[PDB]
Structure formats: structure tokens, C-alpha cells
Amino acid sequence: AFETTTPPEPPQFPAEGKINYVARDTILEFKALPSYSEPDWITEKFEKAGKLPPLKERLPEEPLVYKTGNMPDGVGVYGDTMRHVVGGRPEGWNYIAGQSQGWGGIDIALSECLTRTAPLFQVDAKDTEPLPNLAKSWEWSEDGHTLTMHLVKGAKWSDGEAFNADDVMFYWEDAVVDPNVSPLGGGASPEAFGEGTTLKKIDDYTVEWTFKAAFPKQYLYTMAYPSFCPGPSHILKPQHPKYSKNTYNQFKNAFPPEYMNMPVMGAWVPVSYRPDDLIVLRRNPYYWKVDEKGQQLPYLNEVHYKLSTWADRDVQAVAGSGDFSNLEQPENFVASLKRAADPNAPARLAFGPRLIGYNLQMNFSANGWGNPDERGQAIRELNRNEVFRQAVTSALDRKAIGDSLVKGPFTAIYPGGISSGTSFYDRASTVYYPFNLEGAKAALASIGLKDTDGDGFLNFPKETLGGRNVEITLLVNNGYATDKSLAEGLVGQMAKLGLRVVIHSLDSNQRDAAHYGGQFDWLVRRNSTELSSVVQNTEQLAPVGPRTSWNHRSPEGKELDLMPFEKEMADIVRKFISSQDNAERADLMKQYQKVYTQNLYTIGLTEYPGALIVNKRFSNVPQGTPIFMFNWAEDAIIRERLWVAADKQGKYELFPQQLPGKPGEGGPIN
């Protein structure tokens, strides 16, 4: 019906900062060092005062040692604070039960995972193994169905309680496997680690995975952020409904933001909170990572999370009151670039590849995900019709969408699928539906949609909903100008097509509950890592499991009503996950891209590059760090390895020479 092509080449972006590519094992290693050191005030005011055990005792036998060769500026010195500004608000501290801490790096900093992938932007190979993190090493069996995972041994939580396999097993069994619990990020279902995957304890520092497929090495990426980040079981397990009289809601809400010094495996601990103002994190004295000189990390003693807006993060970073920003809203690009143009600017700004994409996602579940009424179900059936999706995508003037956010070389024509900024992208495999409004109007008439009341808007046939006008709800995040602008644009464009679209503008936490719960027709969404990197959370590319897809989930317990193209997509993703051949993998992502964009798994809105804004006083910030690839730049820059020269240090500490207090007390100890 439509004359498809490939998307036109965008204006050549000279992608600012260049990456110094290194091999995978240049960053870190696990080993015992002859001696260890820490800030002098800890030894003098805490150890010598009998307030804290000596350093060698608080550390594991073989801590994670950062190698100096990879450090952009070398070994650091202690002091200073990294100041962050966020548009999110904390729900509480129960990350594994799906509670958000406010985003913008806070949960990234608090929740350490089995593996780590965000610093992999600097490693050149599409067959790279994720970095060891809480899992120090792992071995595959000869058949490739068994994965033996060795954990960091002798490490402790920020409260001094031992970290071991029991924390890993409580997360797997009582957060992932438990159907009533949904960990933060919305992708921690058991099938995300493969359908039929089991995990068992061997001993206190050894776990064993059993997979149906042979060598599905891609699941090591799923073991990174956000899907495998264990919580303190000694604190969380007594609150869990299986071991208490608590409901699942009571367990999820057992640790509100006012609960202080929540145990973490991260570099800093939350010590202070003031509603709609600030969150203060203080150095974790039990942190299990050190530099080559034996200095216990982090170098920075404090971290601030100012509770403001996402736009204000860009404002404060160029002004110098904030130290970091991911410039990701095109409406803020010109104002930020003008301010960064000054040689006296306190921060540096660098654009990366086009890895920020937006998609229109349609709910594909006709089996009752989100318990829809007669109207909702009729929309599910329209969404599932290929001709309907072809009309919606063809009715979008993508050049006008791009220009509505920012004029210039930033935006690129984005039909949907894999981001043009990743190596796995193939332009020739991307199906582009050019702007054809008349063809789109004709396509809808061809499936029995016509204006029966004379208002120009199309009606359902007499048999469906009494022949009333078609009305579609559109779920949006109200925290961003970009999301709102795209939602408003979609309403106006669909009105030209004869479709009435109604905005459902919700805050981040309400938006997540409506999305993951299936209570939506359509939704405007910024892409996650699977479309910007392919290799990070590959299971989210298709409905490989009942809850792995963002737009096609099944309610527990009903089976997935997959359309043939979705099953073809699920087979390609499964093949790629278990593929050991680089040429085969590249080819599978070409097939995937073709199936996705021809059948319109989602509908692309726009794609553009983001910019990393970092305060100039910070040392060890890697050159060319993207804002978003394997994860957000807050993770990619390795914040525990950042330092400031003594003569350049700011005096921003709110709890100087203080350490975190006890969980549920009492603020910092002093």
C-alpha cells in the first residue's frame, strides 16, 4: 500500500570528544595488596577512637583493584563532593522491590551489581565480556549449560554485615522469581535470564546458573545494572511476606526516604534527606574497591542529590552549582552551548553519537494485560492490525517532529528500532515509511474505519462500541519538556489522520506503574539500553519471555498472544544471545532491524545525540564518555575513581570528617 525506503542520512555530526579504546582487562583486577590506606581522619578520629574496625579487617581478602594505566589522570587524592541535580523524587530505599531513589545517578551509586558494563564504551569489540563486579570471576562448563560464579570474598555491607551468596539468593528467589515483587528498572523477570534458567548456591561465595541454551553469554549483561543488583538481605528478608506478617505493599514501603543509613555495597551511603530539597550520601567505610597504591575508594567523601527538575540539572551544571549533567533535551541545547562557549565556563560540554531515541509504543496484549474495558480491548485489536500501524507511522512528518525540538544537525529521521549511533545498526535493513497522510487516511478506510457522525474523526464500525469515534489514550512522563512536546505533536498529527488522542500525563512512578501494569493504549517513551547498544539487556528487544517486552506482556497467569513477526523476532534474539560468531551476530541484528521496522514493533518519533557536562575541577573523567550506551554516564565515568587536585578542591561537604551512622538511626556518626 505504501512505498517504503531506507531512512535518509542525517547531517554529519563531528561527534565531539573521541574515545581512547582499551582492552577489557586494563581497568580492574581482584588481588590482595601488601598494605592499604584511607583518609587520615578515619584512622585518627574513628579507628584510634575505637569507633570503627581497622581498614584491613573491613576490606575483602582480594578487593577490586583499579589499574592505574586505565585511569585518565592516574592515582587520586582524597576530598571534595560531586554535586548532582535530579528531577526525580525518592519513593524509599527498597530498590529490589521497585522503589525509586530519585534517578540521576543515586540508585546507580547505591546499587552495585554482579557485573558492570557502563565503562565498556571504551573497550573496542562487540564480543566483550562484562566487567567483574560483585561476581569476581566465572567459568562455563564444557556443554555450556552451567555457569559457576565466584563472588568477592570477605566484603561487607556499609553497616559491617557480611556480603555473600545469601544476598544473591534472596534477590533471585524472593525478588526475581517471586511474581509479587518487581525490582527497579522493570526488566528483572526470571525469563530475562533465559526461559527455564535456575540459580543455586554452592557455598557462601559460589553460585551456579543452569541455562537451557549452550553458552548464552549475553545474560552476563543482564547481571549488570539494573536487573541484578542485590539488596541487604539481613535488613530486607525480615520484612518480606514469606518470612513476616507484612503484605507485599508493606515490604515495598518498609524503608521510606526518612529511613537513614540503608546498607549498600556502593561507594557512598544515604545519611541525610530533606523533602523536595536534598539527599546527602557519605563515603562507605566498608567499600571493597581500592586503587593500585592501596587507597580505599571513593576519593570523593560526599555526594549530593539536589531535588529539583531535569532542566535545572543543565542550568546548575553550566552555572557551576551542579557538577554533572546529561544534556538530553534538545530544547535546552542552544542555551547550554551558549553558556559553555565562554572560556571562563566552570564546566566542559561534549556531544556523543545519536543514541537518544523516542518511540511511540502500542499495547499489543489482547489477552488482558492491564485488565482493559471494551474501549481498551478495541484499541488493543487496532494496535495488533499491521495496516493500522502502517497508517499511524506514515501520518508522521518526522522532519517537522525533529524541528519542533531543535533546528540544525542534531535530529535524524528515526523510523524505530536499533539506534543509528550503534555499530549493530544497518541503514539498508531499516524500513522507512515516508510522510504520506493521504495514503494513511486511505489505509484506515480500507480496514473499515470511517467518519459516521460528520466530525472528520473516524468511528468504530456499528458492531464495535456502538460505532463511536476511535479514542486512544497516550501515556507520558510529565518531568521532561521533550516527552510532553512529542506527546502534544502526536495528538495534533493524529487529529489530521482522524484519530482522537488523549494525553495521560503522569509523574515517573505513576507512569511506570501504568506502563508495567499494562494500563495504557499508547505511550511516548525514551529508549533504554537494548536499542542504544543491542548487547545490554538483549532480552528486551523482543517478547522472549512473558514480561521481557515493553509493549507486549501477559498478566500472571495468562499466556502471550504473540503475532507471527514477534515470534520471528524472539527467535532471532534467542539465536543472538547464544551466538559465538561476530559475523553471524551482525547479520542477526540486520534481520532483527528488518522484521522490527517492516512490521512496526514500535513507531519511531526522533533520534539525536546527547552531551556530557562535567565540572572542570574533576580528574579521571574518561575522554569521549557517551551520556547513554551500556548505561547512563553516571555509571560509565566510574564516580568512585574520580578525584580533584588538593589546590582545586571545592569546600562543599555538609558532613566533613563524618561517617554514616547505623541503619534506622541517628544521622552521620562524627
Contacting residues toward ligand BQZ, per CB under 6 A: 88, 103-105, 108, 310, 326, 328, 477, 508, 512, 632, 634
Chosen residue from 57, 381, 507, 665 binding Cl ion by CB under 5 A: 507
Contact (Cβ atoms closer than 8 angstroms) between residue 158 and residue 197 = no
Judged by CB under 5 A, the chain residues 259 through 288 that form the site for Cl ion are 260, 273, 275-276
Contact (Cβ atoms closer than 8 angstroms) between residue 132 and residue 651 = no
Chosen residue from 469, 485, 510, 649 binding Ca ion by CB under 5 A: 469
By CB under 5 A, is residue 467 in contact with Ca ion? Answer: no
Round to whole Å and give the CA distance between 448 and 460.
8
| Amino acid identity for residue 406 in this structure | V
Whose cell is 539527599? That residue is 279
Closest approach, Cβ 242 to Cl ion, in A, equals 11
Cα–Cα nearest to 346, from 319, 327, 326, 325: 319
The residue among 470 and 524 lying less far from Ca ion, judged by its C-beta, is 470
With CB under 5 A as the rule, give the number of residues binding Cl ion.
14
Contact (Cβ atoms closer than 8 angstroms) between residue 546 and residue 187 = no
Collect all residues with Cβ–Cβ distance below 8 Å to 105 and sequence separation of at least 6. 84, 86, 305, 324, 632, 634, 635, 639
The residue among 119 and 626 lying less far from Cl ion, judged by its C-beta, is 626
Contact map string, positions 563 to 602, toward Cl ion, x by CB under 5 A: ----------------------------------------
Chosen residue from 61, 173, 451, 581 binding Ca ion by CB under 5 A: 451
Collect all residues with Cβ–Cβ distance below 8 Å to 496 and sequence separation of at least 6. 395, 437
By CB under 5 A, is residue 643 in contact with Ca ion? Answer: no
Q: How far apart are the first and last CA of the chain?
A: 72
Chosen residue from 8, 54, 69, 179 binding Cl ion by CB under 5 A: 69
Chosen residue from 626, 660, 663, 668 binding Cl ion by CB under 5 A: 626
Cis peptide before 357 (omega within 30 of 0): no
**Stretch in the footprint of Ca ion (CB under 5 A) among 99-107, 394-402, 445-453, 661-669:** 445-453
SS3 state of residue 325: strand
Contact (Cβ atoms closer than 8 angstroms) between residue 406 and residue 331 = yes
Closest approach, Cβ 317 to Cl ion, in A, equals 14
Strand partners, 270: 281
**Stretch in the footprint of Ca ion (CB under 5 A) among 127-135, 204-212, 229-237, 454-462:** 454-462
Residue 278 belongs to what H/E stretch? strand 278-283
* Residue 326 interacts with which of Ca ion, ligand BQZ, Cl ion, none, CB < 5 to 8 Å by class: ligand BQZ
By CB under 5 A, is residue 448 in contact with Ca ion? Answer: no
* Residue 105 interacts with which of Cl ion, ligand BQZ, Ca ion, none, CB < 5 to 8 Å by class: ligand BQZ
The residue among 164 and 326 lying less far from ligand BQZ, judged by its C-beta, is 326
Contact (Cβ atoms closer than 8 angstroms) between residue 66 and residue 289 = yes
The residue among 381 and 507 lying less far from Cl ion, judged by its C-beta, is 507
Closest approach, Cβ 332 to ligand BQZ, in A, equals 12
Cis peptide before 298 (omega within 30 of 0): yes
Collect all residues with Cβ–Cβ distance below 8 Å to 352 and sequence separation of at least 6. 15, 16, 17, 421, 609, 610, 611, 612, 624, 625, 626, 627
SS3 per residue for 129-163: CCEECCEEEEEECCCCCEEEEEECCCCECCCCCEC
By CB under 5 A, is residue 244 in contact with Cl ion? Answer: no
Closest approach, Cβ 519 to ligand BQZ, in A, equals 16
* Residue 108 interacts with which of ligand BQZ, Cl ion, Ca ion, none, CB < 5 to 8 Å by class: ligand BQZ
* Residue 104 interacts with which of ligand BQZ, Cl ion, Ca ion, none, CB < 5 to 8 Å by class: ligand BQZ
Binding site for Cl ion (CB under 5 A): 67, 69, 89, 247-248, 260, 273, 275-276, 352, 507, 610, 626-627
Binding site for Ca ion (CB under 5 A): 451, 453, 455, 457, 459, 469
